[PDB]
Every structure is written in C-alpha cells, then in structure tokens.
Symmetry: C5
Subunit: 146 residues, 5 copies
C-alpha cells in the first residue's frame, strides 16, 4: 500500500523523550520507505504530555486537512493513581476526536509499568519498534478513508 498523496499528522508528547524519539522515527521512516509517503506531507507537532494529546490533535485537525493522524505518548506507572486516570482519559479522548472528526486517529500510546517496557517497544534492547506498525496503520486508514 502506497500513499504518495497522503497528508499525515503526528502529534507526540515530550515526557519520556528517550522512548518517544525512536517511535516517531520508526513511524516516519516506515511511511516514507515502505509506503512512498512524502516527507513534505508529514507534519510533526508536539505537546507537553499525553494529557494534551487529544486537545493538540483536535486543534490541528481544525487548522489543516489530514488523511490520518498518529497520537504518540508514553505513560509510565508512578506511585499514585495518576497513571491509571490519565491513561483512561487520554484513550477515550483520542477515540472521541477520531469519531467526532471522521479523521482516522492511530493509537501510538504506550501505557507501561516501567521504562524498560517502553524502550523495548520502541525497538531498543532487542525489541520491535511499534512506531513502524503505527506508520503502516496510518497509511492504510488514510487510503481507506478516501
């Protein structure tokens, strides 16, 4: 599946940047190299934390036109219930924004127990980079939308 005409938006948070960067890279590279997406057609915005993800995406969806958007963030369990509540709220938020707008929203949210799990799913320490999968999913949903 190739989408030379696809316009993709990527909004990522900045918490746990060590895990986030590889994820964004994987997503971008895969779209470009495996799906012929054009670098100029990929916008990359960022927000402070995962909580801002739904809101950041919604604001951008109103500004420009995209065929698909990927929300990327990394939530790690802490000592409080903060993680549980934010996670639940962000996941529902992302789903709402996609259903409300009609624009496919790909879930690049990692909700892990600790750092190691995040890094692993970002392709480090022998793991598989999940951003790659998200890249392909974005392309696919973008096309099926047209």
């Amino acid at each position: 599946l190739k989408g030379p005409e696809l316009r993709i938006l990527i909004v990522h948070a900045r918490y746990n940047l060590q895990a986030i960067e590889p994820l964004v890279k994987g997503a971008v590279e895969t779209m470009i190299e495996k799906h012929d997406v054009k670098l100029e057609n990929i916008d990359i915005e960022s927000v402070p934390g995962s909580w801002e993800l739904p809101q950041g995406i919604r604001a951008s969806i109103a500004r420009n036109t995209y065929d698909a958007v990927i929300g990327i963030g990394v939530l790690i369990k802490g000592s409080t219930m903060h993680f549980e509540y934010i996670s639940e709220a962000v996941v529902h938020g992302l789903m709402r924004v996609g259903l409300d707008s009609g624009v496919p929203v790909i879930l690049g949210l990692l909700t892990v127990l600790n750092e190691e799990q995040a890094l692993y799913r970002a392709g480090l320490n022998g793991g598989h980079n999940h951003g790659n999968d998200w890249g392909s999913a974005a392309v696919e949903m973008g096309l099926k939308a047209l």
Copy 2:
C-alpha cells in the same frame, strides 16, 4: 428468522488472524445457511487492529447503507496495561457508533488472557464458534430495525 433483503457489513481487524478467520467464516456461513442472507449482500472490510474498528465502521456506515454491522477483533492480554485501555476504549467506541448511527452494531470482540482462549471461542480445540451467534444476532437486529 430469514433476511433475504438484509445488507450486512462485517469489519474485522487483522491481529491474531488465526482466530479471526474462523470467526468471520462462522458469521458468514450462519447468516447464509441459516438465515437466507445473500452472499452478494455481505460486505467484508478489514482494518489493522481493534482500535481501528469503531472508526472503520463509522466511515463505512457513512458510505453505504447497512441493516446491521458486526465488529470482529481479538485482543489478548500482554505485559503492559495496553490491553486494558484499548479494550475499554473500543467497547465504548462500538457502542457509541451504534447509538449515534441507529445502525445495530454486533459485538464480535474477544478480550482474552491468552491465545488458547481465543482459538477456543473461534470453534477450534473443541470450542464453539462464536461467530455463528454473531451472525444470527446481526440478522435478528437488522430485521427488528426495519
């Protein structure tokens, strides 16, 4: 109950295809063989993962007209909280799409602890294929809708 005039949509994810195929088959066969649904009147779309299910269904519901739709996906517990949050979000999502559109959405989502449980509910290893039940449910809700 027979629905020769019913138009049914089936959207399934592609994760855990070993479990998904039998489910789709069961659903289709049952509708055709037990309810006189016409093969030509059954559309089968697919999406990457369960997360795309609500969005895929919504997009299609807008394109064409269906009497009922079946969302099929298989979520398996992993090492992180990913499973819990995606499950909760997809289930609420599917319910929303059905209530928003007025089109009956049948739940063919399996949320299991491991592969064996999925395969079992797909009719393998002595289990009962749940896709069959979903097929009948779709037909029934489609008729009651008219």
Copy 3:
C-alpha cells in the same frame, strides 16, 4: 402509586433465560397487580444479548411512545474479561439512552459471578424477585415524568 394510563416498554435479552423469565414475570405482575397498569399497555420486546439492550431500547423509543422502559439482562462472569467490558459498556449505554431521550430507563441488569446469584435475585431458592422492584420503579418514574 397507580398508572392506568402508563405505557411501559420492557426489552430483555435471551441469555440465561432461566433467570430472565422470572424477572420479566415479576416486573409485569407487580405493575399490573400493585399499580393498575394495563396488560395491553405493556410491550415486551427481546434481543439476543445484553449488548443489544441499549440499541434495542433506542430503536423502540423512536418507533412508539412510552412513559418508561425497563432493560433486563443477565451477565455472568466467564473465563475472560468479556464480562467486565460488556457490563461497563451496557450500563453506560442504558444511561445514555435514557438521558438522550428523556425517557426513564430502569436498570434490570444483573452482573453476577455465577448462575446461583442470578437465580437468587430472580426470586428462586429463597431469594427476592428484583423484577418486582423494577416494576414499581418504572411506574413511579413514568408518572413523575408526566
């Protein structure tokens, strides 16, 4: 409280019929015998499972006019997380349908760990039939709605 003019709708699922029948009976009998509701004024629809409850109710609410509706279903914990997710989604769904329509929706949903608990709350094995309470609640909310 008597509601001779009340029009009540009862939508019940068909899973765990052993527990469902007594519940419907209790609800109907109580409304008729204790509240003077007229048998002709009580519609009884059914759907495959609890998941279809919100959707079934919504469809009917659009067709005819009712003063109150009772959603009856029985969900039993199985081996997977299926029970937890369906339960949460159905409960939110029923609440939405009632708030969206302005029509009182009485919760006749049992979310139990096993069969015995269901049967018991259906008035068998020394238990109290909860359908009765639901019957009275429906009548009361219907009147307060007018």
Copy 4:
C-alpha cells in the same frame, strides 16, 4: 456566603433511608441556618434508587429553574459487581447532567463498603454529617453561577 434568592433542588434516592434522611436534613438545615436560604425556595424530590438520580435531576431541570441541585444517594457494596457498575454509571451521569445543563450539580453520593460507613458519614456514631458540606457547596456554586 448567603443566598436569600437562591432556588435549590434536592433529589434523593430511597435506598438506605436510615442514611439518607440525616443527609438531606443536614443539607437543608445548613443552607437555611448558615446561608439564609429560604425554606420555600428548596424543592425536595425523590426517586427509587441512585440509578434514577441523573434522570430525576434532568427531568426537574427541564421543568423549573434552579441555581444548584444536590444529588443524594447511598450505594453499598453487595455480593455482585452491581455496586461497581451502578456507581460508575451514576457518577458519570451526574457529571453529564451538570455539564449539559450548565446547572451546578453537587455530588451527595456515598459509595461505601457497608452500612456503618454510610451512617458514619451521615453524622451518626461520632461521624460528621456530609450533607452539611453539600449544602454549603450548593449555595456557593449557585452564587458563582450568577
């Protein structure tokens, strides 16, 4: 803070009346004695159970005009998952009704493990009556609304 002109609505369920009455009293008395709210300006409706709370409040909010409303109910953990699902649904429902209507809805819902805990929070057995706090909150939000 005094609100002589405030019109307050109180909707309470009837389950666990032993705990509910003290709560309503505390709320009413505090508003009157500490905030100069007029007895004639306080409406008190009731519903069967906590599930009817959101619906009861919504119906009344449409009938008359209020500056604030207090939802009072007592949910006690039983042997099934009933408590968990009803609790979650009612809390979300009350929040929705307030955000939808723009009318402040004060949470006078107790979600406890057993009777003792309820009675205690109702001011009995050495406890502090929480209805009092709700009374003050209602007055405060009602004023800030104007």
Copy 5:
C-alpha cells in the same frame, strides 16, 4: 516560550489547601517569571472540591475568554470507594470541557494514596513542585492554540 498576551485561567478546589497553595503559587510564578505572562492576565477562581472543577471551568469559559485554563485539585484515597469514582468522573469531565470548548485544559489534579504524596508533588519535603510544569504547559498550549 513567552506569552505576554496570553490570558490564563486557574480554577482550584479548596480541599487539602496545604497542598493546593504551593501548586497555584508554582504555576503562577513560573508563567510570570519564565514565560513573561502578566499578573493582570491571570484569573484565579476557586471551588469547594474537585467535583466542582469541570463545572467551575465550564461556567468561566462561557463568561470570559482565555487561551488556556489549569484545573487544580487534590484527591486523597479515603476508606470508601468515593476517591475512585470522583477521580474517574473529574478526569473525564475536564477532558470533555476542553474538547467541547476548544480551550486547552491543563490537568493539575493529584490523585494520591495519602497526604505525604500530595505535599511531595507540591514541592515540599524534597519534592518537585508540579504546578511549575503545569504553568509551562498552559503557556505552551495557549500559544499553539493561536
């Protein structure tokens, strides 16, 4: 990032004031000192408890115009399930208000097991004041909104 023209709203609850004051201070000081936000351009409202947070914010969002709002509250686990249900409802409520209005809502909600954890995240006893981070997040989201 500097926002001399930004208008920021801060709504905080009054429960656990020992933890709330430092949080508000941190937020305000950071915006002013690190982002050139003007003291006159920062409104600070308050509400009784965290439950009133979404409602308070919504009311204010309707009155005036803000570029971003920060919701600050502290919920501590008690002996009942009260904490769990209020937390879930408030977090979803805040997300809704931001998505509904299009105005960025920063989450300054602490959901902790005990006081010590709250104080610690408020910058006391060797901890880092989280209000600071919230201040920067507000400024950032406010600008990206314009």
